[PDB]
């Protein structure tokens, strides 16, 4: 009861942490993909690959958190956008790795930033709504 | 697209985490203090005690990370708010423990929530500003040259 309330409130820190880590994974993927387009070395290709695994890991962690009703709606949208984003970043990396046109690399890569922006904008809104519901639930328990 | 830019951007996650975690430690000290005062019992004194050590650790993690210039203002004040809030929390505890008068304990208790809400308000403002700053730095870092 008190224990179950406290269990609810203690999700805050981890929920916020998972959201930011998904945020940061989306960034790191964009950053590593851009850098590999820029300089098609082994270490760069490897860093991109590692970034995509980090992204799948962050999406999964994020997916597992209980969310507020508002929060869960956005969450679905966020998670549904992650596979297309990964997919596009994989095509980029592949286009580079296989020696594509400097023009084909440019085109694959140009696809990413609109997806990145959308993904980051949804997570930012998720953070805002969830934190508001956290504040309401917080007050109910401490009252 | 240099290494120095990854290092900058990789601070986002931990900083955000340390902010949420301090937010949570502060709630948790409030929640255990209240529960103790409502129902004085050994495990509840223990938890308030544990919550206090947790808050000192969360403050220390948060104080350790670099912050944007906007944050640095709010930041300084957040951290200075912690000791007074802990000190009040100890005084509520100690009052319940030493066998306080139902009135005096209500007074010490009442002195907590204002301090909690102010600190949490600051923290959330800090989060919003740092987020806006991180979003602008990320954008710039990934801009086409
Ligand atoms: Cl990054
Ligand atoms: Cl709600
Ligand atoms: Cl709590
Ligand atoms: Cl922006
Ligand atoms: Na509040
Ligand atoms: Zn990175
Ligand atoms: Zn709500
Ligand atoms: Zn708690
Ligand atoms: Zn700034
Ligand atoms: Zn942007």
Numbering used by the authors:
A (entry chain A): 37 to 179
B (entry chain B): 37 to 181
Sentences from the paper on this structure:
Many of the HK and MCP signal transduction proteins span the cytoplasmic membrane and detect extracytoplasmic signals/stimuli via “sensor” domains that face the periplasm. Binding of a small molecule or other stimulus to these domains initiates a response in the cytoplasmic domains, which in turn triggers the downstream regulatory processes. We have undertaken a study of the periplasmic sensor domains from A. dehalogenans 2CP-C with an eventual goal of delineating the functions of some of the signal transduction proteins (The term “signal transduction proteins” hereafter is used to refer to transmembrane sensor histidine kinases [HK] and methyl-accepting chemotaxis [MCP] proteins only) from this organism. Although sensor domains have been studied for many years, there are still many unknowns about the actual ligands that stimulate a given response and the mechanism of signal transduction. It is now apparent that both HK and MCP proteins interchangeably use the PAS-like (including tandem PAS-like) and helical bundle sensor domain tertiary folds.
Periplasmic sensor domain (residues 33–184) of chemotaxis protein Adeh_2942 was isolated, purified, and crystallized as described in the methods section. Adeh_2942 crystallized in space group C2 and diffracted X-rays to 2 Å resolution. Structure was determined by SAD method utilizing the selenomethionine residues and refined to an R-factor of 0.198 and R-free of 0.251. The sensor domain of Adeh_2942 crystallized as a head-to-tail dimer comprised of monomers that form up-down four-helix bundles. The four helices are formed by residues 38–75 (α1), 77–101 (α2), 104–134 (α3), and 137–179 (α4). The helices α1 and α4 have a kink at residues Glu46 and Ala146, respectively. The N- and C-termini of the sensor domain are juxtaposed so they can attach to the TM helices as expected in the full-length protein. In case of Adeh_2942 sensor, the crystallization process selected a head-to-tail dimer; in contrast the well-studied sensor domains of chemotaxis proteins, aspartate receptor, Tar, serine receptor, Tsr, and the nitrate sensing histidine kinase, NarX form head-to-head dimers that are considered physiologically relevant, and the ligand in each case is bound between the two monomers. The four-helix bundle structure of the monomer observed in Adeh_2942 is similar to that of Tar and Tsr sensor domains. Comparison of the monomer structure of Adeh_2942 sensor domain with that of Tar and Tsr has revealed a minor deviation from helical secondary structure in helix-4 (residues Ala146 and Thr147) in approximately similar location, however, the two prolines present in Adeh_2942 (residues 149 and 150) are within the helical secondary structure.
